[PDB]
Write an enzyme that holds these catalytic residues in place. Structure first.
Site, PDB file in Angstrom:
ATOM      1  N   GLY C  10       7.777 -11.144  -4.214  1.00 20.73           N
ATOM      2  CA  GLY C  10       7.955 -10.262  -4.644  1.00 20.73           C
ATOM      3  C   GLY C  10       9.544  -9.088  -4.281  1.00 20.73           C
ATOM      4  O   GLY C  10       9.788  -9.362  -3.562  1.00 20.73           O
ATOM      5  N   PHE C  14      10.470  -0.746  -2.112  1.00 21.15           N
ATOM      6  CA  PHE C  14      10.094  -1.520  -1.073  1.00 21.15           C
ATOM      7  C   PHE C  14      10.837  -1.979  -0.580  1.00 21.15           C
ATOM      8  O   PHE C  14      10.938  -2.436   0.905  1.00 21.15           O
ATOM      9  CB  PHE C  14       7.996  -1.338  -1.241  1.00 21.15           C
ATOM     10  N   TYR C  82      -0.199 -14.697   4.904  1.00 17.25           N
ATOM     11  CA  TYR C  82      -0.349 -14.452   3.273  1.00 17.25           C
ATOM     12  C   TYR C  82      -2.294 -14.407   3.118  1.00 17.25           C
ATOM     13  O   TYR C  82      -3.353 -15.099   3.966  1.00 17.25           O
ATOM     14  CB  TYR C  82       0.117 -16.012   3.306  1.00 17.25           C
ATOM     15  N   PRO C  84      -3.132 -15.381  -0.558  1.00 17.25           N
ATOM     16  CA  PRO C  84      -3.598 -16.155  -1.998  1.00 17.25           C
ATOM     17  C   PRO C  84      -4.693 -15.835  -2.736  1.00 17.25           C
ATOM     18  O   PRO C  84      -6.131 -15.289  -2.497  1.00 17.25           O
ATOM     19  CB  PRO C  84      -3.869 -17.465  -1.609  1.00 17.25           C
ATOM     20  N   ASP C 126       0.563   7.292   0.412  1.00 18.30           N
ATOM     21  CA  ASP C 126       0.837   6.320  -0.712  1.00 18.30           C
ATOM     22  C   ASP C 126      -1.027   5.549  -1.210  1.00 18.30           C
ATOM     23  O   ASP C 126      -1.610   4.898   0.315  1.00 18.30           O
ATOM     24  CB  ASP C 126       1.981   5.552  -0.239  1.00 18.30           C
ATOM     25  N   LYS C 128      -1.792   3.047  -4.320  1.00 16.63           N
ATOM     26  CA  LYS C 128      -1.436   2.551  -5.820  1.00 16.63           C
ATOM     27  C   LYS C 128      -2.269   1.097  -5.633  1.00 16.63           C
ATOM     28  O   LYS C 128      -2.696   0.777  -4.209  1.00 16.63           O
ATOM     29  CB  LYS C 128       0.268   2.123  -5.932  1.00 16.63           C
ATOM     30  N   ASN C 131      -1.428  -2.342  -4.136  1.00 19.85           N
ATOM     31  CA  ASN C 131      -1.055  -2.548  -2.462  1.00 19.85           C
ATOM     32  C   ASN C 131      -2.782  -2.967  -2.231  1.00 19.85           C
ATOM     33  O   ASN C 131      -3.640  -2.615  -1.455  1.00 19.85           O
ATOM     34  CB  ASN C 131      -1.211  -1.366  -2.021  1.00 19.85           C
ATOM     35  N   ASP C 144       1.894  -2.493   2.788  1.00 15.61           N
ATOM     36  CA  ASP C 144       2.638  -1.234   2.251  1.00 15.61           C
ATOM     37  C   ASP C 144       2.051  -0.506   3.278  1.00 15.61           C
ATOM     38  O   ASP C 144       0.900   0.422   2.414  1.00 15.61           O
ATOM     39  CB  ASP C 144       2.793  -0.873   0.405  1.00 15.61           C
ATOM     40  N   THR C 161       4.603   8.662  -5.921  1.00 13.89           N
ATOM     41  CA  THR C 161       4.382   8.872  -7.203  1.00 13.89           C
ATOM     42  C   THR C 161       5.037   9.104  -7.915  1.00 13.89           C
ATOM     43  O   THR C 161       3.466  10.050  -7.510  1.00 13.89           O
ATOM     44  CB  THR C 161       4.125   6.977  -7.552  1.00 13.89           C
TER      45      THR C 161
END
Lengths: 405, 295, 310, 162
Positions: C10, C14, C82, C84, C126, C128, C131, C144, C161
């Site tokens: 990505g 950020f 990670y 997935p 934040d 959104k 995330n 994030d 935002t």
């Protein structure tokens, strides 16, 4: 417009035979004792005037002379158009003459730039096109029309294009200079015109439509970019290659991808009247304040076009609301343009309460607000663009395919 | 004040109407089963283009449809390149990714519906999407070239077939070459089965119609006219694929002639005087010019 | 640089995030590069310091692990586990809209994380839809967290935002929780109507809509949440009925929200209502087709004395 | 379905008026004529920021103002660098040419009417567009640093006392 002979049905000698029948028909149709809606009174008055004038040649002689003069003018115009069509033209241009300065704007067809003459010295506009993109798409029929449109010009609105020049892999066409700017930029800057400005724009639109229909030349292309404002305080049209006049129908879909009526989206025929529809939605931008289609995907635009529904905020005029409501069905069969002369129902409408095309015919009415002309090279009104020189190798690429020019 | 938008030129493929020669009926042949054909028809009916098409064109497209088997991990169509094909996901699920400022964002998939690249057939434009394989499946569709060719051929056939059938009528002198196309376009189509009355008796006959296909026996009720008392089949004027009726109805103004009757599947037109009265006006004043014929 | 990269994951304001394989064990992990270019060009060291101080002694199920952290002479790379599966916004845009159980579970998770953050005095800041990570076992994770604060106190920070703000943030007014609640009232809208909440071609319209609290009743909306949406937007917060300090004795006693067995949800046991379809190590069907940009390693020391706390 | 625009952050300098800096009561007032202030108040009494503000703050903002004489043809602002100033439409024609994807296009010409530049005071954002001066004039150069500092200090003092 309304011929005295066709009002009651009489030949050269108006006798007392069909006059009584026409009077009886007129009386049975219009009746003040029973009818009282608007518009019928004027029609009845005109019918009575025609009936009373048919019985006296002293009052019909002027109308007959006017009709004869109009017919002679139409015949002369048709003869001139035929002569221009049957008269080729080429080998009257050269590259080593005009030197470019900067770019004015490129698109998916050509690039307009500013040029200056090496002899006298005057700023002008030049459209450059590359055959590399035309060979892949094969659009020689649309380009061949320009060869004849260059000569088919005998009116003020018709921009008298200059001589073109075809190179080994590039074509150039010089045109008049436009110190002013485009109407789309002004609309986006303001977003709401007044009553006088809207009336003047509608009058100019009607005038150019009548001029284009007189020659029976399909406009075909239509977009906000095809409307420039000259320093003289007038309106001019650009991009005429799409124009073409064929006896039969056609199928080359190209011009109004967004403002496409539901009659052509299904891959069917069309007439010149569509030119109004594709432009009608434009009036919305000059009334509401926002674009017509409030979406981004073509599917939503098509659904909104097929769905007969148009908002009417508290900002439209009185006659404009009725004009927009009258045109709402999917199959626009009762079009106001598909008529005999095509200049009666639109001119006699309540929107055009006061008009005078004779004043504009001779070009002598100052516009409401002319763009500021800060001397030659006043390219501040037009939109800027990045410079892009001609980076093409000098090599022939199918010359026989571009013989006629 | 506004995000704004570009004003890019749009394009479509050209054609030569003068070129009448074409294939015999169809190039690609692949008759599928009945269930698959019904499913494809039901999925295509949801499209706006298939709202006005007749069963003939639908059957032609079904017979000329092309099937392509896509395995797992296969890739053929890609963004950027000029789109020159079109398919429809008959089964399964395949997510489509569209570019978004250097990011192939997803848009969605379809399941026995939809149409990947349906707009590409409306105009020539680069590939504005990206398909990816997921599992073995079959996609039905046709390329843009053959589809446009068939569409233009059908349009030309529908435009040219109709007119030659009216030029033989000596009545047709006022219409110009430009009005013939408008009259042909305004003419519609209607189907009538057996027993379905075209129009009730005693109606105000003030129009004109022509039979397209199927014999039509016009009859009336034996009463005023001197004939047999027992009502039956009156020998008024049997209309066929070539005859005409309704012309003598604007100056004569005679009593009720008779009523038509559609025997079995009969296809007729749908003319109307309202559309003709918009430009030339009432035909009463136009037909009066050729008075030497009727007198 | 003891990590073999595979492919980018990505790129945005950020920062950059790539995929790496642990050389000491062999496992796919995420590596986020701080870059520091935009930080020095926009001044964002306070947020990073606050996030570091928070993570120094904070651990909960709704948080990502901090395993090995690497700082170079002019760059920094944070390693994380990670997950997935991809974000839920992609599936929402592909399908269209979820059902009532989905929104109920989302609200339950939101209140759970809010209570968890309030237990240790924290603010999410934040928020959104980009995330969220859904694994195969149903364990949801949030990413994030740079936009946070150690103690609520009473500052006047401005970030987030434009599509998630309130009049209290436009003119700083503390907004100890309104920014985390008022804006939330619109979040459900994004997961309810068939189009985005804010659809305008100018930020002035968005600001006017945010200031003028008024929800447009969609043509197809359930009558249960209609009353809740008709009152979610407000100026103050004490007037709100369901807004107790506990945050558990108000959402559970609601109309539609009643059978929200939070005891089984907070313990990570109930499976998610939509599990992503796996295929192999490091799936990509759910993720977008984004490409890799131009990567560059360090050359010399330029701003290594910034995070001088390790 | 849609282009789907990005959603970048809008962070900025966390101004914590409590123990920052060393100076105090750094108002730096710049008085001017009365006619100019009276003419500017007509437009200042209609912005979203001034629609709900204490009279003292409005008077302080009206008193604190710096003038800058700009002649014809001067690219003082260009789309690219960071934006920290609030320009008020005082007088003279000014064209707003935005570089839409690297292409210049006039957004909306300002001639002693309207209001713009307030967005720069909302958060850290680059230059909105190129402000081309078609003729000489005198603009108002209000920097971002001054606006938040007193506007938050007054509120903090009122909350601490009141």
């Amino acid at each position: 417009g309304k011929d005295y002979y066709q009002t009651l049905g009489l030949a050269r000698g108006a006798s007392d035979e069909e006059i009584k029948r026409a009077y009886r028909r007129q009386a049975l149709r219009y009746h003040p004792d029973k009818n009282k809606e608007p518009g019928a009174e004027e029609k009845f008055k005109e019918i009575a005037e025609a009936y009373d004038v048919l019985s006296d040649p002293r009052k019909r002689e002027i109308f007959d002379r006017y009709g004869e003069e109009v017919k002679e003018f139409l015949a002369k115009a048709k003869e001139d158009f035929l002569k221009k069509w049957e008269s080729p033209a080429q080998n009257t241009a050269h590259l080593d003459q005009f030197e470019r300065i900067k770019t004015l704007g490129t698109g998916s067809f050509g690039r307009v730039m500013l040029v200056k003459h090496k002899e006298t010295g005057n700023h002008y506009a030049m459209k450059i096109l590359d055959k590399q993109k035309v060979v892949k798409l094969k659009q020689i029929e649309h380009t061949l029309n320009e060869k004849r449109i260059l000569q088919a010009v005998n009116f003020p609105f018709l921009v008298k294009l200059e001589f073109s020049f075809k190179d080994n892999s590039n074509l150039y066409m010089v045109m008049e200079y436009v110190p002013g700017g485009e109407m789309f930029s002004h609309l986006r800057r303001i977003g709401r015109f007044s009553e006088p400005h809207a009336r003047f724009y509608a009058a100019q639109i009607v005038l150019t439509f009548e001029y284009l229909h007189s020659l029976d030349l399909i406009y075909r292309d239509l977009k906000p970019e095809n409307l420039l404002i000259d320093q003289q305080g007038y309106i001019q049209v650009t991009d005429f290659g799409f124009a073409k006049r064929v006896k039969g129908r056609t199928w080359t879909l190209c011009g109004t991808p967004e403002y496409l009526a539901p009659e052509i989206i299904l891959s069917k025929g069309y007439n010149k009247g569509v030119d109004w529809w594709a432009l009608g939605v434009l009036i919305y931008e000059m009334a509401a304040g926002y674009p017509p289609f409030f979406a981004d995907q073509p599917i939503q635009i098509y659904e909104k076009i097929v769905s007969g529904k148009v908002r009417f905020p508290s900002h439209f005029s009185s006659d404009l609301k009725d004009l927009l409501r009258n045109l709402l069905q999917v199959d626009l069969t009762k079009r106001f343009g598909n008529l005999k002369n095509g200049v009666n129902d639109i001119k006699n409408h309540k929107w055009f309460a006061t008009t005078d095309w004779i004043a504009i015919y001779q070009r002598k009415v100052e516009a409401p607000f002319i763009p500021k002309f800060k001397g030659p090279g006043d390219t501040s009104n037009f939109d800027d663009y990045e410079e892009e020189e001609i980076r093409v190798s000098i090599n022939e690429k199918c010359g026989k395919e571009f013989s006629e020019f | 004040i506004n995000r704004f938008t570009r004003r890019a030129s749009v394009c479509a493929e050209a054609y030569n109407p003068d070129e009448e020669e074409d294939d015999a009926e169809s190039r690609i042949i692949h008759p599928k089963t009945d269930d698959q054909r019904n499913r494809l028809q039901e999925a295509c009916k949801d499209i706006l283009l298939f709202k006005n098409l007749d069963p003939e064109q639908m059957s032609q497209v079904l017979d000329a449809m092309f099937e392509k088997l896509v395995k797992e991990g296969e890739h053929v169509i890609d963004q950027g390149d000029d789109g020159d094909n079109f398919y429809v996901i008959d089964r399964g699920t395949f997510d489509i990714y569209v570019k978004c400022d250097g990011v192939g964002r997803c848009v969605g998939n379809y399941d026995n519906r939809g149409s990947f690249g349906e707009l590409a057939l409306m105009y020539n434009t680069p590939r504005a999407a990206t398909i990816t394989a997921t599992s073995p499946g079959a996609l039905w569709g046709l390329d843009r070239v053959t589809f446009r060719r068939i569409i233009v051929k059908n349009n030309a056939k529908k435009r040219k077939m109709y007119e030659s059938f009216i030029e033989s009528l000596p009545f047709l002198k006022s219409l110009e070459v430009s009005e013939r196309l408008k009259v042909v376009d305004v003419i519609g189509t209607k189907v009538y089965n057996d027993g379905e009355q075209i129009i009730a008796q005693g109606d105000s006959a003030d129009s004109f119609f022509i039979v397209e296909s199927g014999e039509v026996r016009i009859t009336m009720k034996r009463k005023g006219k001197s004939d047999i008392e027992e009502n039956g089949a009156v020998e008024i004027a049997r209309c066929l694929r070539g005859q005409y009726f309704g012309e003598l109805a604007l100056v004569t103004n005679k009593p009720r002639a008779a009523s038509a009757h559609a025997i079995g599947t009969v296809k007729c037109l749908a003319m109307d005087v309202q559309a003709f009265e918009r430009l030339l006006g009432p035909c009463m004043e136009i037909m009066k010019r050729n008075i030497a014929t009727y007198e």
